[PDB]
Design a protein around this ligand. Structure first.
Ligand SMILES: CC(=O)O[C@H](C[C@H](C(C)C)[NH+](C)C(=O)[C@@H](NC(=O)[C@H]1CCCCN1C)C(C)C)C1NC(C(=O)N[C@@H](Cc2ccccc2)C[C@H](C)C(=O)O)=C(CCOCc2ccccc2)S1
Ligand SMILES: Nc1nc2c(ncn2[C@@H]2O[C@H](COP(=O)(O)OP(=O)(O)OP(=O)(O)O)[C@@H](O)[C@H]2O)c(=O)[nH]1
Ligand SMILES: Nc1ncnc2c1ncn2[C@@H]1O[C@H](COP(=O)(O)OP(=O)(O)CP(=O)(O)O)[C@@H](O)[C@H]1O
Ligand SMILES: Nc1nc2c(ncn2[C@@H]2O[C@H](COP(=O)(O)OP(=O)(O)O)[C@@H](O)[C@H]2O)c(=O)[nH]1
Ligand SMILES: [Ca+2]
Ligand SMILES: [Mg+2]
Ligand SMILES: [Mg+2]
Lengths: 54, 439, 431, 346
């Protein structure tokens, strides 16, 4: 039993009760990865249209 | 007053979005045309509700929201719905071809076409904000757009809004309502990519919500409508602190401070009671003691797991209705001796409590009954890690044989990104064990 | 919306194709004039998937009719929904393929293929968002077999980012006496393995056995066989044609059904199996539908599912029933047949329920299975092939049209690889 | 038909349960990695509890209680007895024990040990790993041994004055088989075993570990008189009850079983709120093997609890059918008088 930091208003009230105490990638790197994918996509398609030409 | 921009990605995100803004509107007394008679400050104001709603000179309360999907069907029902007048056409963004339950299509192939347009539309809302707090992102783990596009957006938002908090509402997949075999793949891939860009993430297991609907609301076979009405009440209880006067969880940074000590372990467990059937002509009204105790019953959790076989890093009780401090302290005091609530040694065994005297609003002609008092407990417990383990095992079963991997490699991804994403989840599982278990 | 372009090639293709249009036109409340006279708006919500709108709310099938024989396409025109089709989309030659794959693929069909693609382009152009193509054809004949597989390849070259669906009627000695069909079939499968995303294996062996044994038709007609095909074709496309969550488009179906690119050959199933013009009075219970649709006697491919394992399954229930009961009975099947579902693909069975039933039935269920048992079908074609090809029998028909023995050796090898590939994943375990 | 998976091939008990279940012809054994099961006879360590109870249209049961290792590990049990206010230092039935690491209560052990030496009381303690067991009257010997072993042991007070069976003057331990079902009904199997020594209990020399340790294993190997008094050093409750009546003028029920029944309850009731599967998405049962020592004043002492206990050859048939009847068949009923004693609790 230890209630602390009781804040009351009109809408309601808030508090804290304690039982016991204690004992990113850059915009470039994104585009690099996104195009790398599209380039693997285009190559896969190119080799298909090459295989379909044959 | 600090503004919050909601973003709804994929079907799941968009449909859960509708359920929320419908519920928010009723809670704030905002009519479906957007008019709010109770608001005496026409055009603007720094009221609590303005954090989620901008105002026009005509007195229309417009959600700070962007709906994005790579298919027009779901967002077309927002454009032609009951709350069509609520949103600007610029807020509702659609492609023509969806991600076909493929993270790769959502993140790379289709995602890359619309990402710049979406950020441009998000920036239009951001420019209306006097002091933007952050973002609440709603999406599925299973969907192609939900998984794929979100992780791309969350990356770009980190770049374009370096200092702004980002909260998730992630719909964890369940086979009772799941529409794709590869949802484990999409789930792991997005969780890995988003992990560094998400400050706090509320997972919702469809299976949990489905079972609660069947068990508590006596619904033979729940639809998304059924799940979404219940999910909206949980989301509303969490966001109530931002939209209403109060002291606890008044801004998005307070969420991570209160619930997230370890940046990677940022998945709180939400437990909500009471969920009672509108059909039930007579029902006993549950005391503060009874609803508080119910938050430690795995049946009432948004993700089914056993907190008794884990450890707590933080525990947060969010009450609505006829609740006074004396009753809550008493209820917790009694629960402490009975229940098994072990906190980690470096955190204090405490409960941060917030009370809103307005009892939970229910959409008329709904499933949920009107109750005098309800509670939503947000607890950061190392038991939620079970959710990862289940998902991670299904990933391993399929990926062992490389089943369905050609669909992802076909859209430009490498087998590298799979094993890379899985090794990050293997690390997250180990992290949750290190914090949680002694033996 | 997501438009599908239909192509029907050869006698078989144009017959099962015509019956498909007769059935789904009735289901969407469209008369032979192409005018809507339906009661439900669910009929029109996703009509643009298979139908082009025109002046005075007129619905025209997005269907291209192809054959090297005028015969079958005069029949289609004369038939009941013969007048619904776009007259320009009738693309036919004068000299047939004489059940020769070489004639259909290289010599005769090569002349006409450019004329077909002109109609494909015209139809593709006016699609808001084309999702792909479905072809009806037989692998036993010449036109559908040879020219169909050429079109598949020529369409893929113009539309390589679009789904390629096929209803491929696999031949049987019980239906046809044409000696060279195993050749035509084996050459066709080689093409399908490489150039199609989804192939519904409609086995004439199964359709005849269903008609003779189950339906008790001592002398079955092609119409008696096609009645099963048209019911199956109505069932598997139900998710594409009506509002739904599961397998709503051709790509999402492929992503749920095809775990490996080459293994895209499905076992269609239907319950209840009905005789043509016989009225079912007793509606089937949900348990009856469920047991029947998974039964070997209700499979349109002449394969025993208990001789293999299910990689993936798609169940489609139709009519007003309890969604709770379907969910229970589908779990019941899986939970009491878990040996026949690969344990390394979790939750590989997916179920859809559609309120609108087909014509003549209050309740029906359609089954789409990616079972490793399908190898039995390919093994049967392979045995028939090797019987003849071992002695180089009836090859003068193909080498006369410019082909080489090598093409046959390659087609044979690719099928034998497809078989052993299915056997690989059948014997595969969690560890 | 019901379905089950076997993930522990060694488990002699559940090898016989699987044999019995199949023989009924209403059960089917799946491949161990098939998730669509009703019953899981799970592996001993690293049992994936987190995955159980998430398969729709299947009630799922497992042959282990999650968190029962708190009772079945030696160091865990000591910590449990001490820390639990339910067991407390009102626990008179667990020998004075201390958890010794090679955080740690190694300091406090010496404080209790020094008191005994000035009291001139028996200062003989036993060190046990979580063969491998040293017994000495000198503390310096026990601590130096544990450091050399390298794993975490427990220094327990050796029952210096045990009850000795005549004729023979033999030490013994009692094994009681307890079955906790999915409703947490505690079932004590009416049949137990006396796992007896075959050499006379020698007070002087503690190095001769055959007359001091009463394990079936160390007997059949090192024992010089194996099977002379009773077959496979296993006396059953019929013969032991008769001995107590003939020698001590008391019954097994009065003298001992009342205390055994109190300890089994006390231990399992204490952990019920931690392991119980009352309102879980899966259900649990587990067989336990409680080990007891009886002293010269017929007072029962708890030695340890065994989480994966092996049954006596004679009894396997009876007990295993009981597990099927009480634990398995209760959750999954079959289609068209009690070997257990239900230890009543609330
Ligand atoms: C009864 C009959 O003629 O059936 C024919 C179908 C069978 C197959 C087994 C399915 N056939 C070809 C035969 O029975 C052969 N026998 C063999 O081939 C047999 C000989 C011994 C060695 C083994 N083999 C397999 C007979 C010698 C004919 C036919 N079915 C139709 C047919 O369906 N007609 C439809 C129109 C049609 C035709 C083709 C495709 C689509 C639609 C008419 C009506 C709607 C109907 O369904 O009955 C044939 C074409 C002629 O149709 C007119 C006709 C003539 C006589 C009887 C019935 C119909 S041949
Ligand atoms: N709770 C809930 N879950 C939903 C809803 N819609 C879909 N889901 C779940 O989300 C997953 C499917 O993802 P969706 O959101 O439909 O997909 P999407 O984001 O539109 O992506 P694509 O269609 O693949 O491009 C499955 O696990 C569904 O069970 C909904 O309205 N509510
Ligand atoms: N406090 C004590 N006093 C006297 N003897 C003891 C004792 N603790 C254990 N023993 C003796 O040591 C033997 C084995 O002890 P223990 O049961 O801890 O070892 P163990 O774990 O290898 C066998 P099990 O796993 O089947 O219980 C017992 O048979 C008992 O006679
Ligand atoms: N099920 C069915 N099979 C057919 C039909 N017409 C032909 N076939 C079979 O298909 C093969 C011959 O193909 P066909 O379409 O006549 O050749 P094409 O017209 O040159 O393509 C043989 O195995 C026939 O039995 C039909 O209407 N229904
Ligand atoms: Ca205002
Ligand atoms: Mg979508
Ligand atoms: Mg012909």
């Amino acid at each position: 039993m230890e209630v602390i930091e009781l804040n009351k208003c009109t809408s309601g009230q808030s508090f804290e009760v304690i039982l016991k105490p204690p004992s990113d990638p850059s915009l470039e790197e994104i585009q690099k990865k996104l195009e790398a994918a599209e380039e693997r996509r285009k190559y896969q398609e190119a080799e298909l249209l090459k295989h379909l030409a044959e | 007053m600090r503004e919050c921009i909601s973003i709804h990605v994929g079907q799941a995100g968009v449909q859960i979005g509708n359920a929320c803004w419908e519920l928010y509107c009723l809670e704030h007394g905002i009519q479906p045309d957007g008019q709010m008679p109770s608001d005496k400050t026409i055009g603007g104001g720094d009221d609590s509700f303005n954090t989620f709603f901008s105002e026009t000179g005509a007195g229309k309360h417009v959600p700070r929201a962007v709906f994005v999907d790579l298919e027009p069907t779901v967002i077309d029902e927002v454009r032609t719905g009951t709350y069509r007048q609520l949103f600007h056409p610029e807020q509702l963004i659609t492609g023509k071809e969806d991600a076909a339950n493929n993270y790769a299509r959502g993140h790379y192939t289709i995602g890359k076409e619309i990402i710049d347009l979406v950020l441009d539309r998000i920036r239009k809302l951001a420019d209306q904000c006097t002091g933007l707090q952050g973002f609440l992102v709603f999406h599925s783990f299973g969907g192609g757009t939900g998984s794929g596009f979100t992780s791309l957006l969350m990356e770009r938002l980190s770049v374009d809004y370096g200092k702004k908090s980002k909260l998730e509402f992630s719909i964890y997949p369940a086979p009772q309502v799941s529409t794709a075999v590869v949802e484990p793949y999409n789930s792991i891939l997005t969780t890995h990519t988003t992990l560094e860009h998400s400050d706090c993430a509320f997972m919702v297991d469809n299976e949990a919500i489905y079972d609660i609907c069947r068990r508590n609301l006596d619904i033979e076979r729940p639809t998304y409508t059924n799940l979404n009405r219940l999910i909206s009440q949980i989301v509303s209880s969490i966001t109530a602190s931002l939209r209403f006067d109060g002291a606890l969880n008044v801004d998005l940074t307070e969420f991570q401070t209160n619930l997230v000590p370890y940046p990677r372990i940022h998945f709180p467990l939400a437990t909500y009671a009471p969920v009672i059937s509108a059909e039930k002509a007579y029902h006993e009204q549950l005391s503060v003691a009874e609803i508080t105790n119910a938050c430690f019953e795995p049946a009432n959790q948004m993700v089914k797991c056993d907190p008794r076989h884990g450890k707590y890093m933080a525990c947060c009780l969010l009450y609505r209705g006829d609740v006074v401090p004396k009753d809550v302290n008493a209820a917790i005091a009694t629960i402490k001796t009975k229940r098994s609530i072990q906190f980690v040694d470096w955190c204090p065994t405490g409960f941060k409590v917030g009370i809103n005297y307005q009892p939970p609003t229910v959409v008329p002609g709904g499933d949920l009954a009107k109750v005098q008092r309800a509670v939503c407990m947000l607890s950061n417990t190392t038991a939620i890690a079970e959710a990862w383990a289940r998902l991670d095992h299904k990933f391993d079963l399929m990926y062992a044989k490389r089943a369905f991997v050609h669909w992802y490699v076909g859209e430009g991804m490498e087998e590298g990104e799979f094993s890379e994403a899985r090794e990050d989840m293997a690390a997250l599982e180990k992290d949750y064990e290190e914090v949680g278990v002694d033996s | 919306m997501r438009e599908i372009v239909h192509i029907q090639a050869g006698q078989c293709g144009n017959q099962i194709g015509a019956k498909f249009w007769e059935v789904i036109s009735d289901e969407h409340g469209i008369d032979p004039t192409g005018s809507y006279h339906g009661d439900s708006d669910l009929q029109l919500e996703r009509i643009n998937v298979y139908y082009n709108e025109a002046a005075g709310n007129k619905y025209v099938p997005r269907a291209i009719l192809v054959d090297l024989e005028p015969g079958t396409m005069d029949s289609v025109r004369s038939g009941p929904f013969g007048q619904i089709f776009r007259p320009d989309n009738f693309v036919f030659g004068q000299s047939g393929a004489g059940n020769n794959w070489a004639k259909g693929h290289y010599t005769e069909g090569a002349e006409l293929v450019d004329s077909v693609l002109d109609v494909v382009r015209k139809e593709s152009e006016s699609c808001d968002c084309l999702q792909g193509f479905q072809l009806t054809h037989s692998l036993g004949g010449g036109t559908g077999s040879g020219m169909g597989t050429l079109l598949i390849s020529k369409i893929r070259e113009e539309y390589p980012d679009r789904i390629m669906n096929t209803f491929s009627v696999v031949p049987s000695p019980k239906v046809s006496d044409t000696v060279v069909e195993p050749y035509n079939a084996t050459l066709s499968v080689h093409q399908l393995v490489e150039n199609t995303d989804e192939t519904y294996c409609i086995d004439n062996e199964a359709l005849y056995d269903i008609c003779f044994r189950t339906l008790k038709l001592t002398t079955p007609t092609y119409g008696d066989l096609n009645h099963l095909v048209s019911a199956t074709m109505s069932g598997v496309t139900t998710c594409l044609r009506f509002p739904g969550q599961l397998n709503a488009d051709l790509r999402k179906l492929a992503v749920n059904m095809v775990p490996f690119p080459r293994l895209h050959f499905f076992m269609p199933g239907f319950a209840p199996l009905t005789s043509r013009g016989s009225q079912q009075y007793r509606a089937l219970t949900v348990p009856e539908l469920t047991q029947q649709m998974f039964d070997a006697k209700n499979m349109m491919a002449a394969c025993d599912p208990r001789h293999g394992r299910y990689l993936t399954v798609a169940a489609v229930f139709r009519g007003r029933m309890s969604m709770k009961e379907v969910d229970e009975q589908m779990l019941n099947v899986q939970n009491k047949n878990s040996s026949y579902f690969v344990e390394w693909i979790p939750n590989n069975v997916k179920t859809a329920v559609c309120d609108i039933p087909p014509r003549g039935l209050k309740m029906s269920a359609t089954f789409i299975g990616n079972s490793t048992a399908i190898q039995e079908l390919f093994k049967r074609i392979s045995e028939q092939f090797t019987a003849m090809f071992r002695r180089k029998a009836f090859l003068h028909w193909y080498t006369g049209e410019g082909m080489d023995e090598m093409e046959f050796t390659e087609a044979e090898s690719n099928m034998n690889d497809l078989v052993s590939e299915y056997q690989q994943y059948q014997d595969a375990t969690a560890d | 038909m019901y379905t089950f998976v076997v993930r522990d091939e060694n488990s002699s008990v559940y090898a016989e349960v699987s044999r019995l279940l199949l023989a009924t012809g209403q059960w089917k054994r799946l491949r161990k990695d098939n998730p669509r099961f009703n019953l899981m006879l799970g592996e001993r360590n690293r049992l994936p509890f987190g995955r159980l109870g998430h398969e729709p249209g299947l009630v799922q049961l497992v042959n282990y209680y999650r968190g029962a290792d708190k009772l079945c590990r030696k160091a865990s049990l000591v910590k449990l007895i001490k820390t639990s206010p339910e067991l407390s230092e009102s626990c008179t039935w667990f020998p004075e024990s201390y958890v010794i690491y090679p955080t740690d209560e190694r300091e406090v052990f010496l404080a209790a040990y020094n008191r005994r030496r000035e009291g001139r009381e028996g200062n003989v303690w036993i060190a046990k790993s979580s063969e491998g067991i040293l017994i000495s009257s000198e503390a310096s010997e026990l601590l130096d041994f544990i450091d050399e072993q390298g794993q975490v042991h427990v220094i327990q007070k050796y029952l210096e004055k045990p009850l000795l069976l005549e004729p023979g003057h033999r030490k013994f331990d009692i094994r009681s088989w307890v079955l906790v079902d999915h409703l947490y009904n505690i079932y004590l199997y009416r049949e137990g075993v006396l796992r007896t020594s075959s050499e006379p209990y020698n007070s002087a020399n503690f190095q001769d570990k055959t007359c001091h340790l009463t394990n079936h294993c160390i007997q059949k190997e090192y024992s010089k008189n194996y099977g002379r008094y009773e077959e496979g050093n296993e006396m059953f409750f019929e013969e032991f009850n008769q001995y107590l009546m003939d020698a001590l003028n008391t019954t097994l029920e009065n003298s001992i079983l009342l205390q055994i029944k109190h300890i089994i309850r006390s231990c399992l009731m204490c952990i019920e709120p931690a392991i119980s599967t009352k309102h879980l998405h899966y259900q649990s049962f587990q067989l336990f093997g409680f080990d007891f020592m009886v002293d010269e004043e017929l007072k029962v002492w708890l030695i340890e609890v065994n989480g994966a206990p092996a049954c006596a050859q004679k009894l396997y048939a009876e007990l295993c059918q009981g597990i099927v009847d009480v634990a398995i068949s209760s959750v999954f009923p079959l289609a068209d008088t009690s070997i257990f004693i239900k230890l009543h609790h609330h």
